[PDB]
Design a protein around this nucleic acid. Structure first.
Lengths: 181, 212, 180
RNA sequence: AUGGACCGCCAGUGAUAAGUGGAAUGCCAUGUGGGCUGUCGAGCCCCACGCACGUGGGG
């Protein structure tokens, strides 16, 4: 499981928050507390690898293993932490999901995002198509007979190098876990 | 007339020229035009003659020259002939009368008086307004405008040492900005080409219009 | 086999972490364990030499040797260690691969990366084109009859001095082990 | 120009061959920045016209 870093440089913004007391005394209007909680927004990139062989080794059976990897992937996309979420609802869904089944070694697309992205525009489209390009050149530089599928929440571009565009996240997960046995 | 955008920088790293003073500044404005014609009449407004507007003075100077002679790039200038250059005709669409066209006018409201131990003098101050009356009084029945009078200071001018080159004095300049209404086309046309007011070599006079 | 150093100065990043424990005893938010593990990221440069002569001496045969060197290069590009990977999937592939066959002496490009690279921009393109420049001037200062080929995961720049751009890593490795 | 004067310790050398620091990890639970507000006369010089109130041109 890898750390999730942004695809564009983001500085932290200092939120000044105050805690007001709901009962007043004369000669003062000071609040109950005063601080500055830090916050930040951005478009995070996330990645994870599942070593099927060793997982079937741990579980022993192959059907239980298949259920564990399917539920793992669905939980990886579905969930979002519960850290400072009650006061800042950040519940979201991944704007791009690309599952690949590799039989030689796992590979991450982190280097695609080394060159930070400058903005004033959006970052979802640029990150998607740039991930596309990196998957294309990487696919033609480390040739391998692997399976590729992806779902996307934006119908503007067509990402060719990412495989066959399935219709929805659970369908993609089902067909990929199926192809992975 | 025509329009161009230019940005002059300081010659060397010790501000030896040109931004050190205003006399060298206008000197760098006349040097770019080699051929110069000059026809005068008993006290009309001058048409010789260049016009320029200083927008900001924090990056050696940001300037806009509108004139008749072609401006030519010189030492320590932009990476091209400009910044930008093109022709403009106050005849385009005739600048239809009664139609609104925006504007940006510089000025120097003044009233002249007799001063003690003088050798009469002019004074930049003419309670409740007086510069509105001054500019709309000079602003004959051509494109009437609005009057954005300010209440601050200041502008200085000193000499670099050259002969026949103004010495050290101060002058205020009001930056009016708005949307001109055209009541006379040839009058506002000729008034823009001439320049509005004295001291056209120190920034005052230049008028630029716009469309709705 | 050479040590792999970054091409740009990188400081360590402390990562505070916690191990929450179930079964609350006091309904406190007290967690079973806290710490701070050190991590770091960057663009590493890697280099290795294979002295064919001594390898053919050890193996004895010339056919076994060729298989060992071909598998060596492919394992060198493919593999990545297993040190703290279960908590951070750092599996990756080299963004630039340059195999050269020299008949006089092996040569490293480490001095090219001595002057650290300042950033706020990317480092892949800058590192690639700078390695190119150093290989060019180095090639015209130490003239030699060698074979050069390289594969790259970026179609932006054109790296001339690194030889003839093969299409893929295993193709480059096949054509280079063959030329050996 | 002194128990000193003159006066070379000194010609040769691989420290060498081998090596994962490695497995595990929510920093968390709570918060108004607030009450109040029209932006409306000394300036240096020259020249021109002037009803001696001033007006315009070039520095």
């Amino acid at each position: 499981f890898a750390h999730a870093f942004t695809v564009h440089g983001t500085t932290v913004e200092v939120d000044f928050f105050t805690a007001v007391d709901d009962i007043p005394k004369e000669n003062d209007h000071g609040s109950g507390h005063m601080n500055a909680g830090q916050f930040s927004a951005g478009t995070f990139y996330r990645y994870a690898n599942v070593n099927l062989d060793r997982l079937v080794e741990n579980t022993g059976d192959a059907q239980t293993a298949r259920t564990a990897v399917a539920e793992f992937l669905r939980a990886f996309l579905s969930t979002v932490p519960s850290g400072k979420q009650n006061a800042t609802a950040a519940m979201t869904l991944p704007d791009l999901v690309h599952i690949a089944v590799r039989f030689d070694r796992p590979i991450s697309f982190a280097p695609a995002f080394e060159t930070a992205l400058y903005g004033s525009d959006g970052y979802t489209l640029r990150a998607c198509q740039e991930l596309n390009n990196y998957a294309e050149r990487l696919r033609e530089v480390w040739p391998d007979d692997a399976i590729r599928g992806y779902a996307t929440v934006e119908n503007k571009t067509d990402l060719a190098a990412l495989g066959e565009r399935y219709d929805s996240y659970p369908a993609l997960i089902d067909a990929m876990v199926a192809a992975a046995f | 007339t025509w329009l161009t955008k230019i940005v002059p920088d300081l010659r060397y790293r010790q501000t030896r020229a040109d931004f050190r003073t205003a006399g060298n500044l206008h000197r760098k404005l006349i040097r770019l035009s080699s051929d110069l014609g000059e026809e005068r009449i008993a006290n009309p407004r001058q048409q010789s003659g260049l016009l320029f507007r200083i927008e900001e003075t924090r990056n050696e100077l940001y300037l806009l020259v509108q004139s008749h002679s072609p401006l030519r790039v010189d030492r320590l200038g932009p990476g091209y002939h400009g910044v930008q250059m093109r022709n403009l005709d106050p005849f385009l669409a005739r600048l239809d009368k009664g139609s609104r066209v925006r504007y940006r006018i510089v000025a120097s409201p003044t009233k002249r008086l007799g001063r003690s131990e003088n050798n009469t003098q002019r004074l930049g101050l003419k309670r409740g307004a007086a510069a509105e009356e001054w500019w709309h009084s000079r602003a004959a029945a051509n494109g009437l405008e609005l009057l954005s009078t300010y209440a601050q200071t200041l502008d200085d001018v000193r000499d670099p040492g050259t002969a026949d080159r103004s010495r050290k004095i101060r002058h205020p300049a009001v930056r009016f900005d708005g949307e001109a209404v055209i009541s006379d086309v040839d009058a506002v046309r000729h008034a823009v080409l001439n320049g509005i007011g004295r001291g056209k070599s120190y920034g005052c006079g230049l008028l630029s219009l716009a469309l709705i």
